[PDB]
Design a protein around this nucleic acid. Sequence first.
DNA 1: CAGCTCTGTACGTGAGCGATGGACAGCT
DNA 2: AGCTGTCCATCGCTCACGTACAGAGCTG
Length: 195
Amino acid sequence: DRFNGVSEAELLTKTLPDILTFNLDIVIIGIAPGLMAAYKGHHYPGPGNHFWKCLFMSGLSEVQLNHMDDHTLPGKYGIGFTNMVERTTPGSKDLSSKEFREGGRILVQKLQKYQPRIAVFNGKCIYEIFSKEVFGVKVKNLEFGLQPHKIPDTETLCYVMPSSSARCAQFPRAQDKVHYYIKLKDLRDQLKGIE
DNA sequence: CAGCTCTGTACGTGAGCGATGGACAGCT
DNA sequence: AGCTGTCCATCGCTCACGTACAGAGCTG
């Protein structure tokens, strides 16, 4: 067993709650919660996931944080959390086309409410669907980083990063993703100097 | 033909897991 | 000196909130 006696079937019935507030700077949008997040009730508890490590190596967090700290982030730092698909999935390749499109609609309504300065898509696959469904734009070479469109009727920017999951071989280490988190830290700073 | 879409497949790290064995202490 | 167990170091192994790209099958 990997979940201390809790069956994987029980975990798929559990959900992970969003941590959203008004006047946030950053909203971290994951694909869908995984088995460990459903179990813990916290964001990115995967012992090999790069999220908390990249958030420190980049300087967004001044100390080395963990999943139990996610609830302190909206007030201490200005970071929020939400997901494209709400349902617990053991992987991104288990989700269906309809599910993501249902999620894209429910996600855009959330962003139009809370209105963060930057919406961070923790995964490229979810921006592919979102761009097509919300902006009617399907481009050949989709890239990471700052995107050209703002969330409809808001001033929220769209930032895309490789998934913090250790699954992708194209960015094998946390060190290989850290660059996007630093460039995100710069965008937050550039925007915070509005005056 | 040229450009598009949908789908199948391969790819690097490092963390946790269960199996295994060598060190070492306690007892004859 | 012989025997027996526990502790822990370590091996082999799988897996993680994906990504990119080749190719078949469309379509203009």
